[PDB]
Structure 1
Amino acid sequence: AIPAFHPGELNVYSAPGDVADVSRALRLTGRRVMLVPTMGALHEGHLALVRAAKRVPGSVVVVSIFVNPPDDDLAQLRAEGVEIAFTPTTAAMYPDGLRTTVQPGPLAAELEGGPRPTHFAGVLTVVLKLLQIVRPDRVFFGEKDYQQLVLIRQLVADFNLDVAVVGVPTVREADGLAMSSRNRYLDPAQRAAAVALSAALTAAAHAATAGAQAALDAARAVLDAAPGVAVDYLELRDIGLGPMPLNGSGRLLVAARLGTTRLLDNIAIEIG
């Protein structure tokens, strides 16, 4: 007895079982199930994850809202033509507490996994679960938190998961600042200083025709031009986060403390 699903309206489900049944029922009848996993507090970035998912012909869009340890968000999705919001409780995602989890590979130890050693294990575990519950054809992440997205690609390859992982370019303020829920915490000076991350990164990207060293130095110069910006790391890696090849396509990642607030950004880089 398949749960009630009204096509073209916004259907909300809090029971995993329900969303799993609705979702399985929709695949069987043509629809391609797109998942956009969020933690609520939805901003334009999210919206651009949703929009991409709808571009896929015949798709139905699942947006989970789960706080991984408000009707305004439901309003945005309804106003976006989202047909499913999956809104489970913590006891429902975790009816037996933390038991079996995912152990990410060694890349979880670096970069962000320095300041936060266990964070990614948590991310990968909830992502596997959501992928299992919803079983989408495709799953949509912003490129902002880039390390996270790569580990997710590693989760999918490593466990032979059947989903396609789509990374959507990061949505930014007018001045380049990568969108983030933390942005509303920076006072004006900090907010104005924050502009340096993306400006460092864009500078690097364009400086890159002169090669690897000039990209890093361009970005480091820009970072240096800003007060109150404590850079935890600034690193050029290959697209999958191993060492940067002598020439080819890579990624440049930055992370920084503006007061209490930790900011991240990253960009694509071609060397030559």
Structure 2
Amino acid sequence: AIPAFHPGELNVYSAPGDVADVSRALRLTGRRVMLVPTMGALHEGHLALVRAAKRVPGSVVVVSIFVNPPDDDLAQLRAEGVEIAFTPTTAAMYPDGLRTTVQPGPLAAELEGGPRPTHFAGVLTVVLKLLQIVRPDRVFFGEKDYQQLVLIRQLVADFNLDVAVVGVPTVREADGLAMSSRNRYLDPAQRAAAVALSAALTAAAHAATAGAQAALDAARAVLDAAPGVAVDYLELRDIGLGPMPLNGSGRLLVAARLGTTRLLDNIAIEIG
């Protein structure tokens, strides 16, 4: 017997089998299941994934909230008209502990995989589990974590997963700072300097009519004008994060530490 589901209300499930049963039952009645994976502490950047999933016709939106090893989140989801929240415990997700896992390809060792070399094996493992529990038609990730998003597209391709991955543009504060729960830690001087990441990327994207080296030098000049911004990398790559082609489309990515807080941003770049 299918667990209880009330159309038009926020239905909260903690057991993986429950959300699985509901989602199978809902898909059979002709709803298209949209999955929006999060770690809770919801802000406007997360709600833009939610809004994107909501506008697919016939959608029922599943928002998962899970931290790799609350009332207000759920209120935000209600206010958004989300009908399902999936809130599993660690034990529900890892009942046999850490056993079979996904091993990413070599892209996971680069860029964010520098400081955190097993970070993405962990992310891909839980993404794959969520896809299998929920079996959505489409799954939504923010472009803010671009390398994560490209890794998910590789997971999907490589394991023949039948789900469409939708990347959602980065939501920004008024001065361009990419929204993130970490921003709250920045003191005023760090918060003022943090604008340099987005300002450097946008400067680079306009300078790119003059070519790839003009785009990189414009970005570096902007970051060089900020105090207390320790750049960990600034790299222009093609859109799948391979090496940047001579011309055409790419992606410019930056990560920097301001005090103890690490910030990331990236932007589409059209070369020449």
- TM-score normalised per structure 1: 1.00
1:144-176 superposed Cα distances (whole Å, 9 cap, x missing partner): 010000000000000000000000000000000
1:57-100 superposed Cα distances (whole Å, 9 cap, x missing partner): 00000000011121000000000000000000000000000000
* Count of residue pairs brought into register by the alignment: 272
1:211-251 superposed Cα distances (whole Å, 9 cap, x missing partner): 00000000000000000000000000000000000001000
Alpha-carbon distance, 1:49 to partner: 0.4
The match for 1:18 is 18
Tell me, what secondary structure is at the counterpart of 2:34? strand
1:33-69 superposed Cα distances (whole Å, 9 cap, x missing partner): 0000000000001111010101100000000001112
Distance 1:7 1:257 in 2: 45
Tell me, what secondary structure is at the counterpart of 2:80? coil
Tell me, what secondary structure is at the counterpart of 2:23? helix
Distance 1:168 1:117 in 2: 25
Distance 1:236 1:184 in 2: 28
Distance 1:118 1:15 in 2: 27
The match for 2:263 is 263
Structure 2: stretches of 5+ with no match in the other structure: none
Residue 62 of structure 2 is aligned to residue 62 of structure 1: yes
Distance 2:161 2:175 in 1: 38
Distance 1:88 1:141 in 2: 19
Residue 187 of structure 2 is aligned to residue 205 of structure 1: no
Alpha-carbon distance, 1:21 to partner: 0.3
Distance 1:165 1:68 in 2: 21
4+ long deviations beyond 6 Å: none
Distance 1:50 1:270 in 2: 28
The match for 1:114 is 114
Distance 1:74 1:182 in 2: 20
Tell me, what secondary structure is at the counterpart of 1:244? coil
The match for 2:236 is 236
Structure 1: stretches of 5+ with no match in the other structure: none
1:96-122 superposed Cα distances (whole Å, 9 cap, x missing partner): 000000000000010011110100000
Distance 2:235 2:267 in 1: 11
Distance 1:93 1:87 in 2: 10
- TM-score normalised per structure 2: 1.00
Instruction: Give me the CA root mean square deviation.
Output: 0.4
1:14-34 superposed Cα distances (whole Å, 9 cap, x missing partner): 000000000000111100000
The match for 1:171 is 171
Distance 1:45 1:25 in 2: 30
Distance 2:48 2:114 in 1: 30
